[PDB]
């Protein structure tokens, strides 16, 4: 089984693996904050992100796909599964400061993952990627 990804309207990216489906969005809103949220410095720490193994596996699959190095790259955040706001994880994709090299490798990884990828992140501005559960669209490949 291989996760399949479909893009609709060239602005939103949807990935479905198994029974788990996510929607990837880019904006400057910092939904997750490092002070109060789980830090993913090791792939085994993602068990705190969800109660469903499908969401954990699909999350781990995506970071492996974009070339995320769990021990060299900046750690990303995810919401503690004990909270009720819902599943989400957030990667800093801002092309600025010391995060420049990682942000540039993330753009390369997305461009190889999705054939049509609109890079919303602009140089010098904060850009935060967030993947949250969503109902799988019936208007995109199955």
């Amino acid at each position: 089984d291989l996760p399949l990804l479909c893009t609709l309207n060239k602005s939103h990216l949807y990935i479905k693996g198994g029974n788990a489906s996510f929607q990837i969005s880019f904006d400057d809103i910092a939904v997750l904050l490092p002070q109060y949220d789980v830090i993913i410095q090791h792939p085994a720490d993602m068990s705190w992100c969800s109660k469903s193994d499908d969401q954990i596996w699909l999350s781990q699959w995506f970071m492996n796909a974009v070339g995320h190095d769990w021990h060299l790259d900046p750690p990303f955040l995810c919401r503690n599964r004990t909270k009720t706001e819902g599943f989400i994880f957030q990667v800093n994709t801002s092309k600025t400061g010391v995060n420049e090299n990682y942000a540039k490798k993330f753009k390369t990884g997305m461009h190889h993952l999705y054939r049509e990828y609109p890079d919303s992140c602009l140089n010098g501005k904060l850009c935060l990627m967030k993947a949250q559960p969503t109902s799988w669209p019936l208007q995109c490949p199955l």
């Epitope: 969005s25 904006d27 809103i29 910092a30 904050l33 002070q35 109060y36 009720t84």
Partner: antibody, heavy 128, light 109 residues
Framework: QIQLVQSVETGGGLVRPGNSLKLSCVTS????????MHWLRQPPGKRLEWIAV??????????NYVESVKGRFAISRDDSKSSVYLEMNRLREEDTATYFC????????????????WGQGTSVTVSS | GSVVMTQSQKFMSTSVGDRVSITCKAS??????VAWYQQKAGQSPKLLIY???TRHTGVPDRFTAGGSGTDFTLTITNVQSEDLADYFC?????????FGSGTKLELKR
């Protein structure tokens, strides 16, 4: 029209210390099952304080409570009745406040606990 | 261990058509996860903005908010008589959700 009505199932707002009171909040004008529900009490002359939250049917009806309230209150919901309830046991005199039910939706595409709409509130006083 | 939201001015006197800013101070950094509400005579609160600066659909154009980190301000331009109410902030970045002390908006005479 996204109307939230609060009522008391048993008796009135006044209750004696150590007794149990159940608060019922009925919603209308929107799909109750889609959004999460919160309970909030406001003490007289004090700031508003969060009490509890219950999530939708997609999640296994999970809930979260505050520390002072853990082990004494229980939040519940009925999608068919489209109403959220708050069962309060071993009530202490500190619990005297006006209780509110509120709805939280999706804000700029992300789940957050900002309160969309509120109930009118029921005054709850506990004394001897 | 719980973030507290303190408002320096418990009461603010203003006139119709004036500009008024209400400041919210957080004990810890809450980033952008801040909302503002309005409450009249102890009735049900009404959401004004969310995510620090995103105005709610029902809210009129007069209300504008902003801020990041631990400092958040809510400004009202061309204040009307119906704007005289209570205003308080809220953070939803961490449990438990905590609200501000509150500011009352009063008319000069």
């Amino acid at each position: 029209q996204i109307q939230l009505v609060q009522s008391v199932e048993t008796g009135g707002g006044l209750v004696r210390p150590g007794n149990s009171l159940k608060l019922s909040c009925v919603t209308s004008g929107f799909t109750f099952s889609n959004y999460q529900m919160h309970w909030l009490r406001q003490p007289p002359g004090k700031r508003l304080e969060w009490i509890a939250v219950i999530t939708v049917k997609s999640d296994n009806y999970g809930a979260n409570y505050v520390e002072s309230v853990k082990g004494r209150f229980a939040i519940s919901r009925d999608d068919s009745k489209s109403s959220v309830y708050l069962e309060m046991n071993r009530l202490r005199e500190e619990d005297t406040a006006t209780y509110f039910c509120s709805r939280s939706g999706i804000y700029d595409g992300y789940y957050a606990y900002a309160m969309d709409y509120w109930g009118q509130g029921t005054s709850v006083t506990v004394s001897s | 261990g719980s973030v507290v939201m303190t408002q320096s001015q418990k009461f603010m006197s203003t006139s119709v058509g004036d500009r008024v800013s209400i400041t919210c101070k957080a004990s810890q950094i809450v980033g952008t996860s801040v909302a503002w509400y309005q409450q009249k005579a102890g009735q049900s609160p009404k959401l004004l903005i969310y995510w620090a600066s995103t105005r709610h659909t029902g809210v009129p154009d007069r209300f504008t908010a902003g801020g990041s980190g631990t400092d958040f301000t809510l400004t009202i331009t061309n204040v009307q008589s119906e704007d005289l109410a209570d205003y308080f902030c809220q953070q939803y970045a961490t449990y438990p959700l905590t609200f501000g002390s509150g500011t009352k908006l009063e008319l000069k005479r």
